[PDB]
Amino acid sequence: ATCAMYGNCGKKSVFGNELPCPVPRSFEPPVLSDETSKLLVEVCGEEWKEVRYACCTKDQVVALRDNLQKAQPLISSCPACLKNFNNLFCHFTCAADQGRFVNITKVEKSKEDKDIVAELDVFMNSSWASEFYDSCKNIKFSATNGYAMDLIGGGAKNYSQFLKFLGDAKPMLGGSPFQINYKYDLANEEKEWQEFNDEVYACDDAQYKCACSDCQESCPHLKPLKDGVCKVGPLPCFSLSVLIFYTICALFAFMWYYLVFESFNNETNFFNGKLANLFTKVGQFSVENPYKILITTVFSIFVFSFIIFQYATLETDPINLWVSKNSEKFKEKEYFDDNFGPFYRTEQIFVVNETGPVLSYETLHWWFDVENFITEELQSSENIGYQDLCFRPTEDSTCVIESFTQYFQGALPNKDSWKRELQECGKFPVNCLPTFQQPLKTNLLFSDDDILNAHAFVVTLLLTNHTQSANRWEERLEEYLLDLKVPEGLRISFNTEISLEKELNNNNDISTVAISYLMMFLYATWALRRKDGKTRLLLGISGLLIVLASIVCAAGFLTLFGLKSTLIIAEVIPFLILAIGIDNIFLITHEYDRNCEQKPEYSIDQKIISAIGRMSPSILMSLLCQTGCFLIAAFVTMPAVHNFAIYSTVSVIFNGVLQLTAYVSILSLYEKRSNYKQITSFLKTFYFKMLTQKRLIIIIFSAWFFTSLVFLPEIQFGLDQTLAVPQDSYLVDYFKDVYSFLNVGPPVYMVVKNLDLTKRQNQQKICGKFTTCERDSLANVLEQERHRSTITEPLANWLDDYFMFLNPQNDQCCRLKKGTDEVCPPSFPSRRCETCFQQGSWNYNMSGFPEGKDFMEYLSIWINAPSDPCPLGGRAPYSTALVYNETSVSASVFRTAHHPLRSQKDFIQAYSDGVRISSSFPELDMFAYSPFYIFFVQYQTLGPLTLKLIGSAIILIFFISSVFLQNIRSSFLLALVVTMIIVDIGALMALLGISLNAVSLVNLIICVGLGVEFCVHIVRSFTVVPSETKKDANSRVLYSLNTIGESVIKGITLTKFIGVCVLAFAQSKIFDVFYFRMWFTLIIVAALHALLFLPALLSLF
Ligand SMILES: C[C@@H]1CC[C@@]2(OC1)O[C@H]1C[C@H]3[C@@H]4CC=C5C[C@@H](OCCC(CO[C@H]6O[C@H](CO)[C@@H](O[C@H]7O[C@H](CO)[C@@H](O)[C@H](O)[C@H]7O)[C@H](O)[C@H]6O)CO[C@H]6O[C@H](CO)[C@@H](O[C@H]7O[C@H](CO)[C@@H](O)[C@H](O)[C@H]7O)[C@H](O)[C@H]6O)CC[C@]5(C)[C@H]4CC[C@]3(C)[C@H]1[C@@H]2C
């Protein structure tokens, strides 16, 4: 047909490539020969089997075939790109209608005085070019670690300039000998020349499908964007729901403006009475035999104090007092540890220049002399150094130090060229290798990639020895770094593996405990004095000693079963039990004084027993409400706070028994012997007058509750690490640095279990680099979940490395002695061994990959490869990432990483991604594991949990109140007040900055217990009244306050005030933030509700 090009007339210059001979557009080439037809179908494709009058000869096709092989390896990953590439250069040289879309701009003379072409012009549809560029745009070269466009396209980012590179005349560098120009626009009104248009194949094509790694389109777009996790609008979703609820509530109010029990009572009444007879009998038994029960108490406490002193007194460590040993994250940790070995122990050192850069010859010279000392000649007491515990990648390899010193291999560089050398090594780590032969990322070494302007560099040391010997060395390193004399301006902050455990069990706040104890003995004596001003010091002493006998009994009774209490939480029980324990002393003693005031016919023995039998249900309900609240708080699974609820539950029970039995006897003896002679309101009228405004108080307090129900969703989550460690420690500085100067994240592992990996079906579920495999494979999904999730850094797939290792192109990798299956020795650099797979036995669509028994035959030589000849050896990188027994690969690990994680909110968000992603593969047994996951397993279900525990506690309070008060209406009011205190404190939790942990969730569950003590006494007096008193509501409530109101203010109210105040001053901030602000806000909030609100509500019950 019409050909503008045909045949070769000779080379343009000596040794130059032969150039084709130009021909007129009317030239008609003869019919093709038999050999040409065979070549065209093979070299180009079967689609050319029909062409008769081609425009190319035998020399042209063989030359074309030779040239095409040049670029075949680069673009062989994606068959679509390869198919398109061949088509463009096949039609351009052999298409019958070559002249239709080809024009000769310039023709030059050859050596043989025969004209040859020097420049050419072609025209094609822009759609064709756009598709062609798209197919080969995202091809990735295995060895270059970058897009293949750099090698073939020269980094071209536009389709227009991509063809330009191909058309560039660069014969010296192997380019096209003659310039080629491509036109993307042609208004061919004349239509003399026809534009070049032909079929275009994209990676999505079924026939020419390409892997996800090759092109974006083939990757899984099945990424349903999870929604609803965050808030909606400018306010939280729940708050908007509440706000509309108030609006509709107001509209209803606007419309308002315009406009058998007897059987239960009898049974309960008999039950209530039976308790009174039971309790008075106990008092008679105790009072009638004072010495008998006093000797037993003294003897018993000595028996129990013996157990705690020697038999059992233990503490714990971070992984035993903050993680439940039954959770799923701890069953996974044990499995990973058993097979793939425990994670490395990590020591980190930060060298920080607060202002300005760090790297200077003075600082660099100084550090080189203190990093060659830690890692070479520290020699802990047992003469074990870092060289006996450090992590060695192989059997014989210098162990890993992740420091910038490794760029120079521990050789102090010269004073002149150190700046340029460091920049070059950082910019291109491949050109600056450490002694253990692996590139060091600049993010793991410096705060920022600028290097020279970095504010701090990080030194990491890895210990693969977990015996107690490694602990001994870390003691020496901790001591060495503390006393190190850094230059002026610089700073150091480090965290050895054992630093956390040492500092947690270091705070000793027992001094302040003895001060709170001293204050309450002072106050108790003052508040227990007689109406005449006389003081009874002995009674006050018994109050303090009686509570101690409860704590010691609990710590001795409970330690028998094997419970261990933490040092941190063993300093909090004394305040809690004493605040609750001493409450019943004043009520019994004070009420006893009243009985002496009137009706003195009874004697001391008869008066006290009457005092005990009268408020016994009031005391009994306090004990039963201080064990349900604590027992419900024992459902928290953190061992540190689960043992705190069990320890307090037993202490409260023992304190009650040792008060209605042992203190009653003591009181009788003290009063009988003393034989006191029979005894012969500012700020109240003002307060009493205030209660006259029933509606003003209710409206104000009601508004406070409702405005505090739209701030609950503003409460944060998580416990800050800096709080736990005591102040002035070296870990407060460290945790501050990790949040600002570290640019790497924990290395999440993706363990896969019970997978065959020997049948081709299973391998396709982890493929990430081949075409015929599944699209939802593990490698493809994890590749896509890198722009939206927290797991960003690339995945280390050992299965794709294994198959690449068998590639015949990498001949050196899989050398096998010819004629045998034995491995070619490394000392055999001769033609005595060949590749495992021949040229035609390996294809990118898994046509000849190992299967069945053959899979484990070659896996035993890849995982033992030296890795020196070619980088695809597997002995060094993936030695410990497999658990195989020459018949299966039962387990395996794929390593990834998170991003910096610079906050407590990112730690919780990251943990969610690990759980979310591990549940995206229903066909696998995958589970992700990172070192920090076990410590954040509580916040996943802390939302529903806190509602259930608090909701359960309020329900329990209502149930017991109805049984004792014998009045449903009164009980409901008490439950309504208690739930009003909890909500109010919850909103104040957001403002004060307290978060929601398992430590501040138990504190909020025992607030209902403490919040019922204030109100239970007021409510009961309202229900039960003397006959002489009027039955009108105002009279009864006024009667109640005048009777038991004083004891609440001088007792339950003020006593807790003294205890909490002392707890504010402490070294650890965990006591100041959680156990003080929570228990100090409760008293103020509960005091207002109990005194100002509750009587107003009762009067209008
Ligand atoms: C909080 C902390 C922080 C995080 C942390 O813990 C927690 O995380 C933890 C995780 C840890 C690492 C994990 C596991 C290893 C493997 C081991 O590794 C064997 C060493 C070999 C590694 O081989 C290959 O390593 C990579 C694959 O593994 C390959 O890269 C890619 O692999 C995939 C691509 O396919 C994709 O994944 C990516 O594209 C890319 O990743 C890489 O290219 C290739 O080198 C070294 O091989 C050499 O072999 C010959 C020498 O022997 C050399 O030959 C020569 O001989 C003379 C030399 O004498 C010369 O001068 C001649 O000129 C020359 O001819 C030859 O050139 C050279 O290759 C070395 C230790 C290390 C790094 C650990 C260190 C410590 C951590 C970073 C911890 C760390 C502390």
Ligand SMILES: CC(C)CCC[C@@H](C)[C@H]1CC[C@H]2[C@@H]3CC=C4C[C@@H](OC(=O)CCC(=O)O)CC[C@]4(C)[C@H]3CC[C@]12C
């Ligand atoms: C009741 C009182 C005494 C508090 C008890 C719990 C604390 C000791 C917890 C609360 C949050 C924990 C921290 C949460 C996050 C991390 C990151 C994580 O760091 C790792 O690299 C993992 C180390 C490992 O796997 O052991 C574990 C340590 C640390 C600081 C934890 C140490 C122990 C902390 C401070």
Ligand SMILES: CC(C)CCC[C@@H](C)[C@H]1CC[C@H]2[C@@H]3CC=C4C[C@@H](OC(=O)CCC(=O)O)CC[C@]4(C)[C@H]3CC[C@]12C
């Ligand atoms: C009768 C009781 C239940 C009322 C008083 C409950 C309070 C203890 C408040 C104070 C702050 C509230 C929390 C503030 C924020 C949220 C939003 C949301 O938190 C989540 O993390 C949702 C997702 C998840 O559960 O992981 C679910 C409710 C929760 C935990 C709230 C539950 C109820 C809390 C604990």
Ligand SMILES: CC(C)[C@@H](C)/C=C/[C@@H](C)[C@H]1CC[C@H]2C3=CC=C4C[C@@H](O)CC[C@]4(C)[C@H]3CC[C@]12C
């Ligand atoms: C591997 C890198 C260096 C990249 C840039 C090189 C690719 C080579 C192998 C490719 C790119 C474009 C190809 C190319 C361009 C155009 C022509 C004109 C033609 O009618 C015969 C084939 C010929 C001569 C081929 C030869 C092989 C070339 C030059």
Ligand SMILES: *[C@@H]1O[C@H](CO)[C@@H](O[C@@H]2O[C@H](CO)[C@@H](O)[C@H](O)[C@H]2NC(C)=O)[C@H](O)[C@H]1NC(C)=O
């Ligand atoms: C830490 O950074 C500060 C700020 O750059 C350094 O202080 C400067 O040091 C240079 C010489 O290195 C002096 O010329 C400047 O006068 C210093 N002050 C300022 C404000 O720039 C300090 O040297 C750095 N630390 C160390 C150990 O050198």
Ligand SMILES: *[C@@H]1O[C@H](CO)[C@@H](O[C@@H]2O[C@H](CO)[C@@H](O)[C@H](O)[C@H]2NC(C)=O)[C@H](O)[C@H]1NC(C)=O
């Ligand atoms: C951790 O290091 C210690 C000390 O090097 C190892 O224990 C030593 O083992 C050698 C070899 O059996 C003995 O000769 C030494 O006497 C041991 N020293 C001590 C102090 O016990 C220990 O084996 C290492 N742990 C691991 C898991 O490799």
Ligand SMILES: *[C@@H]1O[C@H](CO)[C@@H](O[C@@H]2O[C@H](CO)[C@@H](O)[C@H](O)[C@H]2NC(C)=O)[C@H](O)[C@H]1NC(C)=O
């Ligand atoms: C893709 O996989 C096939 C599977 O065998 C490879 O081999 C081809 O198999 C088909 C089976 O119908 C034959 O028709 C082809 O002739 C085979 N290809 C040959 C002999 O080259 C194939 O090589 C793989 N690669 C592709 C399709 O590009």
Ligand SMILES: *[C@@H]1O[C@H](CO)[C@@H](O[C@@H]2O[C@H](CO)[C@@H](O)[C@H](O)[C@H]2NC(C)=O)[C@H](O)[C@H]1NC(C)=O
């Ligand atoms: C080699 O390991 C494989 C693990 O895949 C063993 O085969 C499995 O063993 C477990 C435990 O007994 C069984 O529950 C599985 O049914 C076995 N078959 C599988 C997982 O396909 C195999 O027995 C081991 N070989 C030897 C000699 O111990």
